[PDB]
Amino acid sequence: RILAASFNKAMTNIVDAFTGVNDAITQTSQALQTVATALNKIQDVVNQQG
Amino acid sequence: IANIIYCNSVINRLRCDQLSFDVPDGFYSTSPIQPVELPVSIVSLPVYH
Amino acid sequence: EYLQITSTPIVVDCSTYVCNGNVRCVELLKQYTSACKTIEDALRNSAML
Amino acid sequence: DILFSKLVTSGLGTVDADYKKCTKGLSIADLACAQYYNGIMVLPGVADA
Amino acid sequence: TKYNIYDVSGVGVIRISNDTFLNGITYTSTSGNLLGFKDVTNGTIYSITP
Numbered sequence: 001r002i003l004a005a006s007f008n009k010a011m012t013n014i015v016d017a018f019t020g021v022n023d024a025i026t027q028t029s030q031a032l033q034t035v036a037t038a039l040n041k042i043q044d045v046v047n048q049q050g
Numbered sequence: 051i052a053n054i055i056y057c058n059s060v061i062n063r064l065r066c067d068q069l070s071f072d073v074p075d076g077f078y079s080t081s082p083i084q085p086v087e088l089p090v091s092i093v094s095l096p097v098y099h
Numbered sequence: 100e101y102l103q104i105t106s107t108p109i110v111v112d113c114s115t116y117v118c119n120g121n122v123r124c125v126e127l128l129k130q131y132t133s134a135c136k137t138i139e140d141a142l143r144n145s146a147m148l
Numbered sequence: 149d150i151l152f153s154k155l156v157t158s159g160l161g162t163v164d165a166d167y168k169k170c171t172k173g174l175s176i177a178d179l180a181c182a183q184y185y186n187g188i189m190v191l192p193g194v195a196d197a
Numbered sequence: 198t199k200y201n202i203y204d205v206s207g208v209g210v211i212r213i214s215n216d217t218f219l220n221g222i223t224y225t226s227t228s229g230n231l232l233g234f235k236d237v238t239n240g241t242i243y244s245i246t247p
Protein backbone atom coordinates (compact mmCIF):
# COMPACT_ATOMS: atom_id res chain seq x y z
CA ARG A 1 0.00 0.00 0.00
CA ILE A 2 2.84 2.42 0.76
CA LEU A 3 4.94 1.28 -2.22
CA ALA A 4 2.00 1.90 -4.56
CA ALA A 5 1.01 5.19 -2.91
CA SER A 6 4.53 6.61 -3.12
CA PHE A 7 4.75 5.47 -6.76
CA ASN A 8 1.43 7.10 -7.69
CA LYS A 9 2.36 10.35 -5.95
CA ALA A 10 5.71 10.33 -7.77
CA MET A 11 4.06 10.16 -11.21
CA THR A 12 1.88 13.19 -10.50
CA ASN A 13 4.96 15.24 -9.61
CA ILE A 14 6.60 14.05 -12.85
CA VAL A 15 3.72 14.91 -15.20
CA ASP A 16 3.15 18.27 -13.52
CA ALA A 17 6.88 18.99 -13.82
CA PHE A 18 6.90 18.23 -17.55
CA THR A 19 4.04 20.68 -18.12
CA GLY A 20 5.57 23.17 -15.68
CA VAL A 21 2.58 23.82 -13.40
CA ASN A 22 4.85 22.80 -10.48
CA ASP A 23 7.91 24.74 -11.67
CA ALA A 24 8.22 26.76 -8.45
CA ILE A 25 8.52 23.57 -6.36
CA THR A 26 10.77 21.55 -8.67
CA GLN A 27 13.66 21.59 -6.17
CA THR A 28 11.71 19.66 -3.51
CA SER A 29 13.80 16.59 -4.35
CA GLN A 30 16.80 15.60 -6.43
CA ALA A 31 14.41 13.15 -8.09
CA LEU A 32 12.68 16.22 -9.54
CA GLN A 33 16.13 17.61 -10.35
CA THR A 34 16.41 14.90 -13.02
CA VAL A 35 13.22 16.19 -14.65
CA ALA A 36 14.76 19.66 -14.94
CA THR A 37 17.97 18.09 -16.26
CA ALA A 38 16.05 16.09 -18.88
CA LEU A 39 14.07 19.14 -20.04
CA ASN A 40 17.32 21.12 -20.21
CA LYS A 41 18.87 18.40 -22.38
CA ILE A 42 15.84 17.89 -24.65
CA GLN A 43 15.52 21.59 -25.49
CA ASP A 44 19.10 21.64 -26.77
CA VAL A 45 18.31 18.73 -29.10
CA VAL A 46 15.14 20.41 -30.37
CA ASN A 47 16.97 23.68 -31.13
CA GLN A 48 20.56 22.87 -32.11
CA GLN A 49 19.65 20.43 -34.90
CA GLY A 50 18.48 23.10 -37.37
CA ILE B 51 3.46 42.53 -39.70
CA ALA B 52 2.61 40.39 -36.67
CA ASN B 53 4.57 41.98 -33.81
CA ILE B 54 7.55 44.29 -33.35
CA ILE B 55 10.12 44.97 -30.64
CA TYR B 56 12.15 48.18 -30.36
CA CYS B 57 15.89 47.63 -29.89
CA ASN B 58 16.09 50.27 -27.15
CA SER B 59 16.48 48.43 -23.82
CA VAL B 60 19.34 46.20 -22.70
CA ILE B 61 17.20 43.05 -22.86
CA ASN B 62 15.73 44.05 -26.23
CA ARG B 63 19.22 44.80 -27.57
CA LEU B 64 20.32 41.26 -26.70
CA ARG B 65 17.12 39.89 -28.25
CA CYS B 66 17.72 41.93 -31.41
CA ASP B 67 21.34 40.77 -31.76
CA GLN B 68 20.45 37.15 -31.02
CA LEU B 69 17.67 37.64 -33.61
CA SER B 70 14.99 35.81 -31.62
CA PHE B 71 12.01 36.89 -29.53
CA ASP B 72 12.75 34.24 -26.88
CA VAL B 73 16.23 33.86 -25.38
CA PRO B 74 17.15 30.74 -23.36
CA ASP B 75 18.62 31.12 -19.90
CA GLY B 76 22.39 31.44 -19.88
CA PHE B 77 25.36 33.80 -19.98
CA TYR B 78 25.60 36.02 -23.07
CA SER B 79 28.46 38.20 -24.28
CA THR B 80 27.99 41.94 -24.83
CA SER B 81 30.09 44.98 -25.71
CA PRO B 82 29.35 48.54 -24.52
CA ILE B 83 28.84 51.33 -27.03
CA GLN B 84 32.04 53.11 -28.05
CA PRO B 85 32.34 56.89 -27.57
CA VAL B 86 32.39 58.69 -30.91
CA GLU B 87 34.03 61.97 -29.84
CA LEU B 88 37.57 60.62 -29.99
CA PRO B 89 40.78 62.60 -29.34
CA VAL B 90 43.93 61.83 -31.32
CA SER B 91 47.28 60.75 -29.86
CA ILE B 92 50.55 60.64 -31.83
CA VAL B 93 53.99 59.34 -30.83
CA SER B 94 56.87 59.21 -33.30
CA LEU B 95 60.64 58.90 -33.40
CA PRO B 96 62.49 62.19 -33.98
CA VAL B 97 64.48 61.70 -37.18
CA TYR B 98 66.24 63.43 -40.04
CA HIS B 99 63.30 65.58 -41.15
CA GLU C 100 43.96 3.75 -14.50
CA TYR C 101 43.48 7.37 -15.61
CA LEU C 102 40.24 8.74 -17.09
CA GLN C 103 39.64 12.31 -18.21
CA ILE C 104 36.40 13.73 -16.81
CA THR C 105 36.46 17.36 -17.99
CA SER C 106 37.81 19.69 -20.66
CA THR C 107 38.33 23.37 -19.86
CA PRO C 108 35.52 25.39 -21.50
CA ILE C 109 36.27 28.29 -23.83
CA VAL C 110 33.80 30.93 -25.04
CA VAL C 111 34.58 33.51 -27.73
CA ASP C 112 32.91 36.84 -28.48
CA CYS C 113 32.35 36.59 -32.23
CA SER C 114 32.15 40.34 -32.85
CA THR C 115 35.34 41.19 -30.94
CA TYR C 116 37.48 38.47 -32.54
CA VAL C 117 36.56 39.34 -36.13
CA CYS C 118 36.30 43.14 -35.90
CA ASN C 119 38.66 44.13 -33.04
CA GLY C 120 36.18 46.67 -31.67
CA ASN C 121 36.02 48.77 -34.85
CA VAL C 122 32.58 50.35 -35.10
CA ARG C 123 32.44 50.16 -38.89
CA CYS C 124 33.44 46.48 -39.07
CA VAL C 125 30.73 45.33 -36.66
CA GLU C 126 28.14 47.13 -38.79
CA LEU C 127 29.20 45.17 -41.87
CA LEU C 128 29.37 41.99 -39.77
CA LYS C 129 25.66 42.29 -38.94
CA GLN C 130 24.74 41.10 -42.44
CA TYR C 131 26.41 37.79 -41.48
CA THR C 132 23.40 37.08 -39.27
CA SER C 133 23.74 33.29 -39.13
CA ALA C 134 27.54 33.24 -38.73
CA CYS C 135 28.15 34.48 -35.18
CA LYS C 136 24.99 32.90 -33.75
CA THR C 137 26.02 29.39 -34.81
CA ILE C 138 29.54 29.78 -33.38
CA GLU C 139 28.48 31.29 -30.05
CA ASP C 140 25.67 28.77 -29.53
CA ALA C 141 28.05 25.85 -30.14
CA LEU C 142 30.66 27.00 -27.62
CA ARG C 143 28.19 28.23 -24.99
CA ASN C 144 25.91 25.19 -24.90
CA SER C 145 28.91 22.87 -24.55
CA ALA C 146 29.97 24.66 -21.36
CA MET C 147 26.44 24.44 -19.93
CA LEU C 148 26.18 20.68 -20.48
CA ASP D 149 50.02 17.15 -5.83
CA ILE D 150 52.77 14.97 -7.31
CA LEU D 151 50.45 14.48 -10.30
CA PHE D 152 50.10 18.28 -10.50
CA SER D 153 53.82 19.13 -10.26
CA LYS D 154 55.71 16.23 -11.87
CA LEU D 155 53.60 16.94 -14.94
CA VAL D 156 54.40 20.03 -16.99
CA THR D 157 53.50 23.40 -15.49
CA SER D 158 51.26 24.64 -18.32
CA GLY D 159 51.68 28.35 -17.70
CA LEU D 160 51.47 28.92 -21.47
CA GLY D 161 48.22 26.91 -21.66
CA THR D 162 44.62 27.44 -20.61
CA VAL D 163 44.24 29.61 -17.51
CA ASP D 164 41.18 31.66 -16.56
CA ALA D 165 42.15 35.32 -16.66
CA ASP D 166 41.62 37.79 -13.82
CA TYR D 167 39.44 40.33 -15.62
CA LYS D 168 39.65 42.72 -12.66
CA LYS D 169 43.39 42.80 -13.48
CA CYS D 170 43.28 43.25 -17.25
CA THR D 171 41.17 46.39 -17.63
CA LYS D 172 42.98 48.21 -14.81
CA GLY D 173 46.04 48.02 -17.07
CA LEU D 174 48.56 48.94 -14.38
CA SER D 175 51.10 46.66 -16.08
CA ILE D 176 51.56 45.43 -19.64
CA ALA D 177 48.96 42.76 -20.31
CA ASP D 178 50.14 39.18 -19.81
CA LEU D 179 49.33 36.24 -22.09
CA ALA D 180 45.92 35.68 -20.49
CA CYS D 181 44.81 39.32 -20.68
CA ALA D 182 46.02 39.50 -24.28
CA GLN D 183 43.58 36.71 -25.18
CA TYR D 184 40.75 38.56 -23.41
CA TYR D 185 41.09 41.64 -25.62
CA ASN D 186 40.55 39.45 -28.71
CA GLY D 187 37.30 38.04 -27.31
CA ILE D 188 38.69 34.73 -26.02
CA MET D 189 37.47 34.02 -22.48
CA VAL D 190 38.62 30.92 -20.60
CA LEU D 191 36.16 30.02 -17.86
CA PRO D 192 37.11 28.52 -14.49
CA GLY D 193 37.37 24.75 -14.38
CA VAL D 194 34.08 23.05 -13.53
CA ALA D 195 36.06 20.47 -11.53
CA ASP D 196 37.02 23.06 -8.94
CA ALA D 197 39.77 22.68 -6.35
CA THR E 198 41.33 57.79 -28.16
CA LYS E 199 42.29 56.96 -31.73
CA TYR E 200 46.07 56.61 -31.66
CA ASN E 201 48.97 56.23 -34.08
CA ILE E 202 51.91 55.29 -31.85
CA TYR E 203 55.20 54.42 -33.58
CA ASP E 204 53.31 53.89 -36.85
CA VAL E 205 50.78 51.44 -35.39
CA SER E 206 47.22 52.77 -35.48
CA GLY E 207 44.10 51.80 -33.58
CA VAL E 208 41.61 52.83 -30.91
CA GLY E 209 42.30 52.33 -27.22
CA VAL E 210 43.08 53.79 -23.81
CA ILE E 211 46.60 54.81 -22.75
CA ARG E 212 47.77 54.52 -19.14
CA ILE E 213 51.05 54.90 -17.25
CA SER E 214 52.80 51.67 -16.20
CA ASN E 215 54.99 50.01 -13.56
CA ASP E 216 57.27 47.92 -15.83
CA THR E 217 60.94 48.67 -16.66
CA PHE E 218 61.07 46.51 -19.86
CA LEU E 219 64.59 47.48 -21.13
CA ASN E 220 64.35 46.20 -24.71
CA GLY E 221 62.62 47.86 -27.65
CA ILE E 222 60.00 50.61 -27.79
CA THR E 223 56.81 48.79 -28.88
CA TYR E 224 55.35 45.69 -27.22
CA THR E 225 52.78 43.57 -29.04
CA SER E 226 50.58 40.55 -28.45
CA THR E 227 50.61 37.38 -30.54
CA SER E 228 47.67 38.75 -32.54
CA GLY E 229 49.85 41.77 -33.34
CA ASN E 230 47.85 44.34 -31.36
CA LEU E 231 49.71 47.06 -29.46
CA LEU E 232 49.93 46.33 -25.73
CA GLY E 233 52.38 49.09 -24.80
CA PHE E 234 55.11 51.48 -25.84
CA LYS E 235 58.03 53.43 -24.39
CA ASP E 236 58.87 57.15 -24.75
CA VAL E 237 62.50 57.26 -25.96
CA THR E 238 63.12 60.23 -23.60
CA ASN E 239 62.70 59.55 -19.87
CA GLY E 240 61.89 55.94 -20.78
CA THR E 241 58.47 55.51 -19.16
CA ILE E 242 56.32 52.55 -20.22
CA TYR E 243 52.67 52.97 -21.19
CA SER E 244 49.90 50.40 -21.63
CA ILE E 245 47.08 50.19 -24.18
CA THR E 246 43.66 48.58 -23.64
CA PRO E 247 40.43 48.65 -25.67
Ligand SMILES: *[C@@H]1O[C@H](CO)[C@@H](O[C@@H]2O[C@H](CO)[C@@H](O[C@@H]3O[C@H](CO)[C@@H](O)[C@H](O)[C@@H]3O)[C@H](O)[C@H]2NC(C)=O)[C@H](O)[C@H]1NC(C)=O
Nearest residue numbers: 006007009010013026027028029030031032033034035036
Ligand atom coordinates in the same frame (compact mmCIF):
# COMPACT_ATOMS: atom_id res chain seq x y z
C1 LIG F 1 19.38 8.86 -4.15
O1 LIG F 1 18.52 9.96 -4.37
C2 LIG F 1 17.64 10.14 -3.25
C3 LIG F 1 16.59 11.18 -3.55
O2 LIG F 1 15.97 10.89 -4.78
C4 LIG F 1 18.48 10.56 -2.03
O3 LIG F 1 17.60 10.67 -0.94
C5 LIG F 1 17.88 11.80 -0.07
O4 LIG F 1 18.92 11.52 0.85
C6 LIG F 1 19.29 12.57 1.73
C7 LIG F 1 20.38 12.05 2.64
O5 LIG F 1 19.90 10.95 3.38
C8 LIG F 1 18.06 13.06 2.51
O6 LIG F 1 18.33 14.28 3.19
C9 LIG F 1 18.43 14.13 4.62
O7 LIG F 1 17.23 13.68 5.22
C10 LIG F 1 17.27 13.49 6.63
C11 LIG F 1 15.90 13.00 7.08
O8 LIG F 1 14.95 13.95 6.64
C12 LIG F 1 17.69 14.78 7.33
O9 LIG F 1 17.97 14.52 8.69
C13 LIG F 1 18.98 15.34 6.70
O10 LIG F 1 19.34 16.57 7.28
C14 LIG F 1 18.75 15.50 5.19
O11 LIG F 1 17.66 16.35 4.95
C15 LIG F 1 16.93 13.38 1.53
O12 LIG F 1 15.81 13.86 2.23
C16 LIG F 1 16.61 12.14 0.71
N1 LIG F 1 15.52 12.42 -0.18
C17 LIG F 1 14.61 11.49 -0.54
C18 LIG F 1 13.55 11.99 -1.49
O13 LIG F 1 14.63 10.34 -0.15
C19 LIG F 1 19.52 9.50 -1.72
O14 LIG F 1 20.40 9.97 -0.73
C20 LIG F 1 20.31 9.13 -2.95
N2 LIG F 1 21.10 7.97 -2.64
C21 LIG F 1 22.30 7.65 -3.16
C22 LIG F 1 22.87 6.37 -2.62
O15 LIG F 1 22.88 8.32 -3.99
Ligand SMILES: *[C@@H]1O[C@H](CO)[C@@H](O)[C@H](O)[C@H]1NC(C)=O
Nearest residue numbers: 172173174175214215216217
Ligand atom coordinates in the same frame (compact mmCIF):
# COMPACT_ATOMS: atom_id res chain seq x y z
C1 LIG G 1 54.22 47.08 -9.59
O1 LIG G 1 55.16 46.16 -10.06
C2 LIG G 1 55.94 45.54 -9.06
C3 LIG G 1 57.01 44.72 -9.75
O2 LIG G 1 56.42 43.72 -10.52
C4 LIG G 1 55.01 44.69 -8.20
O3 LIG G 1 55.72 44.22 -7.08
C5 LIG G 1 53.85 45.53 -7.65
O4 LIG G 1 52.91 44.68 -7.04
C6 LIG G 1 53.18 46.33 -8.76
N1 LIG G 1 52.26 47.24 -8.13
C7 LIG G 1 50.92 47.26 -8.24
C8 LIG G 1 50.27 48.34 -7.41
O5 LIG G 1 50.27 46.49 -8.93
